Design a protein around this ligand. Sequence first.
Ligand SMILES: [Mg+2]
Ligand SMILES: [Zn+2]
Lengths: 69, 96, 122, 53, 106
Amino acid sequence: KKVYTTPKKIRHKHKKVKLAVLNYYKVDDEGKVAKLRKECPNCGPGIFLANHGDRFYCGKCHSTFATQK
Amino acid sequence: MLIPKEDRKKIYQHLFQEGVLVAKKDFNQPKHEEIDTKNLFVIKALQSLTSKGFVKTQFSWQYYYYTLTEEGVVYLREYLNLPEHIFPATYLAGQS
Amino acid sequence: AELTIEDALKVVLRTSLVHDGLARGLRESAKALTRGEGQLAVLVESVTEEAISKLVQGLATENNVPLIKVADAKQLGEWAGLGKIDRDGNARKVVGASVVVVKNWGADTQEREILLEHFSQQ
Amino acid sequence: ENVWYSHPRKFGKGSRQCRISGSHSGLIRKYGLNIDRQSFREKANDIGFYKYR
Amino acid sequence: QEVVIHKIRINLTSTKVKQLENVSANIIKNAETFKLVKKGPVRLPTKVLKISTRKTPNGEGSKTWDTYEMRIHKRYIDLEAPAHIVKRITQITIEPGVDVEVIIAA
Ligand SMILES: [Mg+2]
Ligand SMILES: [Zn+2]
């Protein structure tokens, strides 16, 4: 065979930067709950939005929002 | 191998009804016959099985053939649940 | 000692894990508790910052309360099943079971229903 | 899982595989065999094809 | 009571000749016992299938060739006979290899 090329730069799959208890939602009293951000309009509650500078997208429906909140 | 675990459970379930599996040697295929998953993922699953005991494998004419052994039937019961007196193809359903 | 020491709740989690009807994790419990799926709720005691404990309290009290104490999470994960093979017996690598919510049930009657009745009716 | 993992291979050499080996070289498609002539040449007597004249 | 003649054509197509000719003889002998008006065992042209192929794998050495071919023997036995007598002649007179088949619709 002929020799291989070798530019240099290699790109690996990102490790993701995992995190737990992360870090939305709150409770002031104890019993009741006080949701932060919002839940999904399309799917049922339990799934939450993603808050950026006037841009949102969900996870269960890959990336399907548009309107602000 | 990096399988969304729901799709894997469907393949196991579909394996246990039949007791048999006729997969192609066709990667890049969008969806498998009968099962609603990619063919490649079924072959990865039946590759993963063959190694840790089970599952008698052939590769003739671009068609893999996988039958479940006695220990293969035991582990598929462990993954799903179904206790005893069940389908596979170890014995007949009624009269056929 | 013939009487069970809260061992009719772990038996539900085994049968739920066996029949494929567990909503283990933080978010799956919330989705289970919202619509008609999650019937029995399981929240961890030892929780840092009190966050995940307070969440399930609210999800329980949102419509129908299905909650109970739970024995330090790690014991439920070992009791249910979190580890492939693990030698001949025991020797499972320890896992925190997190928040869990029961779907399906499957098995009927026995001590599990007796513990659910006493905690609910007061 | 990645999006672009497929050129449009409806036709030509790259689409037409054989039933047996998976080859794109000397492929009998006549009478819809879909067999590389060398495997055909092996099994021809099995598939009903005999040398008469 | 019925005696409703649908006009049924029988298709006999196969590789082997000595079976096919014996099968074709068996149906007409059944027609002679059941005594029906029928056109005899019609014999259509034999579609010979010619796969031309070089003998080699490598394409090296001399350029030799093998006409791997298949004989086919397409025959017909047209019946001017009812539906029920055809149901009888389908049940009996079945040999291995030869492709027995019924058109049934004139
Ligand atoms: Mg290179
Ligand atoms: Zn969405």
